[PDB]
């Protein structure tokens, strides 16, 4: 019976200026024309989110819980993690990461400046000596762009982000980076989502579904998961980590960060005021993704048992959960789901929207996406992942009319390269603007599984072939429902129909070829679809020449991570 937060009454304030509406760009209109449906969240709506994330939590454990837990620990005891040298940790820090409140920022930290490495060592030392004093944190209102839509009733309030000082963040890396990059797959195997790349996730979902006599799957939407995490859940996560083979120093740092940071602590707004007290999951620490994934999996696996699901397979990504199993008849399936929901609720994890059995894999949404079909060169049936393009396009627009240090369009192109909208619009629109400014060589940052990466457009052809397979460049004969969903979206926002883009694609793939080099390798592989005349595409040379491990190994959302 512990509230997830307590509030002092002080407002959540912003630091920088917050743009609510879309500007007045002319390229932005080349993408979207209904600019009034696009919008960003601001600290103005922060109090509404506060209401939502604030509630009492009731939790009642049971034998199924302890059993699964015990099983997890067993698997964890087979994991050995190392500490990260201050230097190593410092490098995993993002150039733009929020500056330390102790005078010094990201570059200072990244360049191993004296001052920074000093404070960091002090903070570390302090963790080893003090194990109880709650570490201070800052709470801001996130600013993300969405599309207005009355079906839901208007606008979504801003999300909240709770994080500790830069000094602390580096310590987290040192004491837990190896754990959160290895412990997950160790305990849950195939159920751990972040070990898969697009091509792998698709293959995993499809195969699991087809392995069932009569498949039945459901996604579980938890009402504000982070707020449902209890102090006991976080302490349990800690015990799991401790099952690892660690250094005595790492153990003490983990216990201290757990008791002083993870379980809870005071929060101040940007103006340094006492905002409230947190007794749930911090949204902006290193263990957020790892912790939610472990806790979601724990409750869900125990819930499955109370529900008696048959031959069930789980796929967990943070709080995002999808379960596939053998059906026991439609009525039994519904009842089993209501029990699963009852056990989750008991484990302190009720749902927002109630789960519903689904018997069509393509009608299931997990990780904001669904499986769909298309065909390859030899007309072979190819499965891929997609989603409604609305948000991606509203954001793709916004980033065209306003500068964003971290875009999303490029990320979406990487995550959804095989989709119709990605290939024909995003790809087209962006190589267009690039060319009109000569920046095809300039790298830009985008996030993948929460981690930051500096990527160069010129490499998409390889990146893409790696993540989705060569077929991704020749997919055709997309399912009508998918083709319909898109065109429906375009007409809703003001985006020229696929035809207007099929035009530009040639008009663009042209200027790209009459440039050879790398810009050529692209315009050929990425736009082979926009030409009746189709030249044969084969394994790209430097498709292998490039390290891509770090990419799909674990989740780091909210973890302030950067990879090179
Ligand atoms: O922030 C996160 O933690 C994050 C998690 C996440 C979990 C699972 C997932 O599965 C899919 C779903 C569809 C296609 C391929 C894959 Br692998 C994708 C993302 N989002 C991005 O990485 C992300 C990056 C760019 C664009 C959008 C999201
Ligand atoms: Cl269809």
Coordinates of C-alpha atoms in Angstrom, one line a residue, residues 172-543:
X172 CA 25.8 3.3 -13.0
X173 CA 27.6 2.4 -16.2
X174 CA 30.6 1.3 -14.3
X175 CA 28.7 -0.9 -12.0
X176 CA 25.9 -2.2 -14.2
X177 CA 26.6 -1.8 -17.9
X178 CA 27.9 -5.4 -18.2
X179 CA 25.0 -6.8 -16.2
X180 CA 22.2 -5.1 -18.2
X181 CA 23.9 -6.1 -21.4
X182 CA 24.2 -9.8 -20.4
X183 CA 21.9 -10.8 -17.6
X184 CA 18.6 -10.5 -19.6
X185 CA 19.3 -13.0 -22.3
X186 CA 20.9 -15.2 -19.6
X187 CA 17.7 -15.5 -17.6
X188 CA 14.9 -15.5 -20.2
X189 CA 16.5 -16.8 -23.4
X190 CA 14.3 -16.6 -26.5
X191 CA 11.7 -14.6 -24.5
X192 CA 14.2 -11.7 -24.3
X193 CA 13.3 -9.5 -27.2
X194 CA 16.3 -7.1 -27.5
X195 CA 18.5 -10.0 -28.7
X196 CA 16.8 -9.9 -32.1
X197 CA 17.1 -7.7 -35.1
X198 CA 14.1 -6.9 -37.2
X199 CA 14.7 -9.9 -39.4
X200 CA 15.1 -12.0 -36.3
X201 CA 12.0 -10.8 -34.5
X202 CA 9.8 -11.4 -37.5
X203 CA 11.3 -14.9 -37.9
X204 CA 10.7 -15.6 -34.2
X205 CA 7.1 -14.5 -34.1
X206 CA 6.2 -16.3 -37.3
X207 CA 7.9 -19.5 -36.4
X208 CA 6.3 -19.6 -32.9
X209 CA 2.9 -19.0 -34.3
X210 CA 3.3 -21.7 -36.9
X211 CA 4.6 -24.2 -34.4
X212 CA 1.2 -24.2 -32.6
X213 CA -1.5 -26.6 -33.7
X214 CA -4.2 -23.9 -33.3
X215 CA -2.3 -20.6 -32.4
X216 CA -3.7 -17.9 -30.1
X217 CA -1.8 -14.8 -29.0
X218 CA -2.3 -11.7 -27.0
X219 CA -0.4 -8.5 -26.1
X220 CA -0.6 -7.3 -22.6
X221 CA -0.9 -3.6 -22.0
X222 CA 0.0 -2.6 -18.4
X223 CA -1.5 0.6 -17.1
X224 CA 1.7 2.8 -16.7
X225 CA 4.1 0.0 -16.0
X226 CA 6.9 2.1 -14.4
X227 CA 4.5 3.3 -11.7
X228 CA 3.4 -0.2 -11.0
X229 CA 6.9 -1.3 -10.2
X230 CA 7.1 -1.7 -6.4
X231 CA 10.0 -1.1 -4.0
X232 CA 9.9 -4.8 -3.5
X233 CA 10.1 -5.4 -7.3
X234 CA 13.2 -3.3 -7.5
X235 CA 14.8 -5.0 -4.5
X236 CA 14.0 -8.3 -6.2
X237 CA 15.7 -7.1 -9.4
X238 CA 18.7 -6.3 -7.2
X239 CA 18.8 -9.8 -5.6
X240 CA 18.8 -11.2 -9.2
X241 CA 21.7 -9.1 -10.2
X242 CA 23.6 -10.2 -7.1
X243 CA 23.2 -13.8 -8.2
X244 CA 25.9 -12.8 -10.8
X245 CA 29.6 -13.4 -10.3
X246 CA 30.7 -9.9 -9.4
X247 CA 33.5 -7.9 -7.9
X248 CA 33.1 -7.0 -4.2
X249 CA 33.2 -3.4 -5.3
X250 CA 30.6 -3.9 -8.0
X251 CA 28.4 -5.7 -5.4
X252 CA 28.5 -2.8 -2.9
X253 CA 27.9 -0.2 -5.7
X254 CA 24.9 -2.2 -7.0
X255 CA 23.4 -2.5 -3.5
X256 CA 23.9 1.2 -2.8
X257 CA 22.6 2.4 -6.1
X258 CA 19.6 0.1 -5.5
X259 CA 18.8 1.4 -2.0
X260 CA 19.7 5.0 -2.8
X261 CA 18.5 5.4 -6.4
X262 CA 16.5 2.6 -7.9
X263 CA 13.9 1.9 -5.1
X264 CA 13.0 5.6 -4.9
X265 CA 14.1 9.1 -3.9
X266 CA 13.4 12.8 -4.0
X267 CA 12.9 14.7 -7.2
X268 CA 13.5 18.4 -8.1
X269 CA 12.2 20.2 -11.1
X270 CA 14.5 22.1 -13.5
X271 CA 14.5 25.1 -11.1
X272 CA 15.9 23.0 -8.4
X273 CA 12.7 22.9 -6.3
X274 CA 11.6 19.9 -4.2
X275 CA 9.0 18.4 -6.6
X276 CA 8.1 15.1 -4.8
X277 CA 9.1 11.6 -3.7
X278 CA 9.4 8.6 -6.0
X279 CA 8.7 5.0 -4.8
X280 CA 8.5 3.3 -8.2
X281 CA 10.7 2.7 -11.3
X282 CA 12.9 5.6 -12.3
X283 CA 12.3 6.2 -16.0
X284 CA 15.8 7.5 -16.6
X285 CA 18.3 5.2 -15.1
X286 CA 20.5 2.6 -16.6
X287 CA 18.5 -0.4 -15.3
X288 CA 15.1 0.9 -16.6
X289 CA 15.0 -1.4 -19.6
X290 CA 16.7 -4.3 -17.9
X291 CA 14.6 -4.0 -14.8
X292 CA 11.2 -3.6 -16.5
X293 CA 12.0 -6.6 -18.8
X294 CA 13.0 -8.8 -15.8
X295 CA 10.0 -7.8 -13.8
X296 CA 7.5 -7.9 -16.7
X297 CA 8.7 -11.4 -17.5
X298 CA 8.6 -12.5 -13.9
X299 CA 5.0 -11.6 -13.3
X300 CA 3.9 -12.6 -16.8
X301 CA 5.5 -16.0 -16.6
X302 CA 3.9 -16.6 -13.2
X303 CA 0.6 -15.3 -14.5
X304 CA 0.7 -17.7 -17.4
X305 CA 0.8 -20.5 -14.8
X306 CA -2.2 -19.3 -12.8
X307 CA -4.0 -18.9 -16.2
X308 CA -2.9 -22.4 -17.4
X309 CA -2.1 -21.2 -20.9
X310 CA -0.9 -24.1 -23.1
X311 CA 2.5 -24.3 -24.7
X312 CA 2.9 -20.5 -24.2
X313 CA 5.8 -18.5 -25.6
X314 CA 6.5 -15.1 -24.4
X315 CA 8.4 -12.2 -26.1
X316 CA 9.3 -9.4 -23.7
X317 CA 10.8 -6.0 -24.4
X318 CA 10.7 -3.8 -21.3
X319 CA 7.0 -3.5 -20.4
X320 CA 6.0 -4.5 -23.9
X321 CA 4.5 -8.0 -23.7
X322 CA 3.2 -10.5 -26.2
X323 CA 2.2 -14.1 -25.5
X324 CA 1.5 -16.9 -28.1
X325 CA 0.1 -20.2 -27.1
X326 CA -2.0 -23.2 -28.1
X327 CA -5.7 -22.4 -28.0
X328 CA -8.1 -24.4 -25.8
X329 CA -11.2 -23.2 -27.5
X330 CA -12.5 -19.6 -27.8
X331 CA -14.4 -19.5 -24.5
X332 CA -11.6 -21.2 -22.6
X333 CA -9.1 -18.8 -24.1
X334 CA -11.1 -15.7 -23.0
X335 CA -11.4 -17.1 -19.5
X336 CA -7.7 -17.9 -19.4
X337 CA -6.9 -14.4 -20.3
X338 CA -9.2 -13.0 -17.6
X339 CA -7.2 -15.1 -15.1
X340 CA -3.9 -14.1 -16.5
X341 CA -5.1 -10.5 -16.1
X342 CA -6.1 -11.3 -12.5
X343 CA -2.7 -12.7 -11.6
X344 CA -0.9 -9.8 -13.2
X345 CA -3.2 -7.4 -11.3
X346 CA -2.4 -9.2 -8.1
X347 CA 1.3 -8.9 -8.9
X348 CA 0.8 -5.1 -9.1
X349 CA 0.4 -4.8 -12.8
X350 CA -3.2 -4.2 -13.9
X351 CA -3.9 -3.4 -17.5
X352 CA -5.1 -0.3 -19.3
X353 CA -6.9 -1.9 -22.2
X354 CA -7.9 -5.4 -21.4
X355 CA -6.1 -8.2 -23.3
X356 CA -8.0 -9.9 -26.1
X357 CA -7.3 -13.3 -27.7
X358 CA -6.3 -13.0 -31.3
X359 CA -6.2 -15.8 -33.9
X360 CA -4.6 -13.9 -36.8
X361 CA -0.9 -13.1 -36.3
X362 CA -1.1 -10.0 -38.5
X363 CA -3.8 -8.6 -36.3
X364 CA -1.5 -8.6 -33.2
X365 CA 0.3 -5.5 -32.1
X366 CA 3.4 -5.8 -29.9
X367 CA 6.2 -3.2 -29.7
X368 CA 3.9 -0.9 -31.7
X369 CA 4.0 -3.2 -34.7
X370 CA 2.4 -6.0 -36.5
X371 CA 3.5 -8.7 -39.0
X372 CA 2.4 -8.3 -42.6
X373 CA 3.3 -9.8 -46.0
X374 CA 4.8 -9.0 -49.4
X375 CA 6.8 -10.9 -52.0
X376 CA 10.4 -11.2 -53.2
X377 CA 12.0 -11.4 -56.6
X378 CA 11.1 -15.0 -57.3
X379 CA 7.7 -14.1 -55.9
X380 CA 8.4 -15.8 -52.6
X381 CA 6.2 -15.0 -49.6
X382 CA 8.1 -12.6 -47.3
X383 CA 7.2 -11.7 -43.7
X384 CA 8.1 -8.3 -42.3
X385 CA 7.2 -5.9 -39.5
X386 CA 5.2 -2.6 -39.9
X387 CA 2.9 -0.2 -38.1
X388 CA 0.5 2.7 -38.8
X389 CA 2.8 5.4 -40.3
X390 CA 1.0 8.3 -38.8
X391 CA 3.3 9.2 -35.9
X392 CA 6.4 8.3 -37.9
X393 CA 5.2 10.8 -40.6
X394 CA 4.2 13.5 -38.2
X395 CA 7.6 13.2 -36.6
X396 CA 9.3 12.9 -40.0
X397 CA 7.6 16.2 -40.9
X398 CA 8.4 18.0 -37.7
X399 CA 12.0 17.1 -38.0
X400 CA 12.0 18.6 -41.5
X401 CA 10.7 22.0 -40.2
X402 CA 12.7 22.1 -37.0
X403 CA 16.2 20.9 -36.0
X404 CA 16.4 17.9 -33.8
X405 CA 19.8 16.7 -32.5
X406 CA 18.4 13.2 -32.6
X407 CA 16.0 12.5 -35.5
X408 CA 13.6 9.6 -35.8
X409 CA 13.1 9.3 -39.5
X410 CA 16.5 7.6 -40.0
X411 CA 15.7 5.3 -37.1
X412 CA 12.4 4.5 -38.7
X413 CA 14.0 3.8 -42.0
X414 CA 16.3 1.4 -40.2
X415 CA 13.6 -0.3 -38.2
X416 CA 11.0 -0.3 -41.0
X417 CA 13.1 -0.4 -44.2
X418 CA 10.9 -3.1 -45.7
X419 CA 7.6 -1.2 -45.2
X420 CA 5.9 0.5 -48.1
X421 CA 5.8 3.9 -46.4
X422 CA 9.4 3.7 -45.3
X423 CA 10.8 2.8 -48.8
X424 CA 8.6 5.1 -50.8
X425 CA 8.2 8.2 -48.5
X426 CA 10.8 8.5 -45.8
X427 CA 13.6 7.2 -47.9
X428 CA 12.5 9.4 -50.9
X429 CA 11.8 12.5 -48.9
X430 CA 15.0 12.5 -47.0
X431 CA 17.5 11.6 -49.7
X432 CA 15.8 14.4 -51.6
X433 CA 16.4 17.1 -49.0
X434 CA 19.9 15.8 -48.3
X435 CA 20.9 16.1 -52.0
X436 CA 19.5 19.6 -52.1
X437 CA 22.0 20.4 -49.4
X438 CA 24.8 17.9 -50.1
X439 CA 25.0 16.0 -46.9
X440 CA 24.8 12.4 -48.0
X441 CA 28.1 11.8 -46.2
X442 CA 27.2 13.6 -42.9
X443 CA 26.4 11.2 -40.1
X444 CA 23.4 11.9 -37.9
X445 CA 22.4 10.3 -34.6
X446 CA 19.3 8.1 -34.0
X447 CA 18.4 5.7 -31.3
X448 CA 18.0 2.0 -31.5
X449 CA 16.8 0.1 -28.4
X450 CA 17.5 3.3 -26.5
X451 CA 21.2 3.5 -27.3
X452 CA 22.5 6.3 -29.4
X453 CA 24.4 5.7 -32.7
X454 CA 26.1 8.1 -35.2
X455 CA 25.2 6.7 -38.6
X456 CA 25.9 7.7 -42.2
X457 CA 23.1 7.5 -44.7
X458 CA 25.5 6.2 -47.3
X459 CA 25.5 2.9 -45.4
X460 CA 21.8 2.2 -45.3
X461 CA 22.1 -0.2 -48.2
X462 CA 24.3 -2.4 -46.1
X463 CA 22.6 -1.7 -42.8
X464 CA 19.3 -2.6 -44.3
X465 CA 20.4 -5.7 -46.1
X466 CA 21.9 -6.8 -42.8
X467 CA 18.8 -6.2 -40.7
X468 CA 16.1 -7.3 -43.2
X469 CA 17.9 -9.3 -45.8
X470 CA 18.6 -8.5 -49.5
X471 CA 14.9 -9.1 -50.3
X472 CA 14.0 -5.8 -48.5
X473 CA 15.0 -4.0 -51.6
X474 CA 12.8 -5.9 -54.0
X475 CA 9.6 -6.6 -51.9
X476 CA 6.4 -6.2 -53.9
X477 CA 2.7 -7.3 -53.9
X478 CA 2.0 -6.0 -50.4
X479 CA -1.1 -7.0 -48.6
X480 CA -4.2 -4.8 -49.5
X481 CA -4.9 -4.1 -45.9
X482 CA -1.4 -2.7 -45.4
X483 CA -1.6 -0.8 -48.7
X484 CA -5.0 0.5 -47.5
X485 CA -3.8 1.5 -44.1
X486 CA -1.1 3.6 -45.5
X487 CA -3.0 5.5 -48.2
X488 CA -5.6 6.0 -45.6
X489 CA -3.0 7.7 -43.4
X490 CA -1.7 9.9 -46.2
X491 CA -5.1 11.3 -47.0
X492 CA -5.6 12.0 -43.3
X493 CA -2.4 14.1 -43.0
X494 CA -1.9 15.6 -46.4
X495 CA 0.8 13.4 -47.8
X496 CA 1.0 13.0 -51.6
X497 CA -0.3 9.5 -52.6
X498 CA 2.2 6.7 -53.3
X499 CA 2.2 7.8 -56.9
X500 CA 3.4 11.3 -56.3
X501 CA 6.3 9.7 -54.4
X502 CA 7.0 7.1 -57.1
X503 CA 7.6 10.1 -59.2
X504 CA 10.0 11.9 -56.9
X505 CA 11.8 8.6 -56.2
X506 CA 12.9 8.5 -59.9
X507 CA 13.6 12.2 -60.0
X508 CA 15.8 11.6 -56.9
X509 CA 17.3 8.2 -57.7
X510 CA 18.5 9.9 -60.9
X511 CA 20.5 12.7 -59.2
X512 CA 21.8 10.0 -56.9
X513 CA 23.2 7.8 -59.7
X514 CA 24.7 10.7 -61.6
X515 CA 27.1 10.9 -58.7
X516 CA 28.4 7.4 -58.4
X517 CA 30.6 6.3 -55.5
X518 CA 28.4 5.4 -52.6
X519 CA 25.5 7.7 -53.4
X520 CA 25.1 5.4 -56.4
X521 CA 25.2 2.1 -54.5
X522 CA 22.2 3.5 -52.7
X523 CA 20.0 5.1 -55.3
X524 CA 20.2 1.7 -57.0
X525 CA 19.4 -0.6 -54.0
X526 CA 17.0 1.8 -52.2
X527 CA 15.1 2.9 -55.3
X528 CA 15.2 -0.1 -57.6
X529 CA 11.4 -0.2 -56.8
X530 CA 10.7 3.1 -58.5
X531 CA 11.6 1.9 -62.0
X532 CA 9.9 -0.4 -64.5
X533 CA 13.4 -1.1 -65.7
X534 CA 14.8 -3.2 -62.9
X535 CA 18.5 -3.9 -62.7
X536 CA 19.6 -7.0 -60.7
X537 CA 20.5 -6.5 -57.1
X538 CA 23.1 -8.7 -55.4
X539 CA 25.0 -9.0 -52.1
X540 CA 26.6 -5.6 -51.5
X541 CA 30.4 -5.7 -51.1
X542 CA 30.8 -3.5 -47.9
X543 CA 27.6 -5.1 -46.6

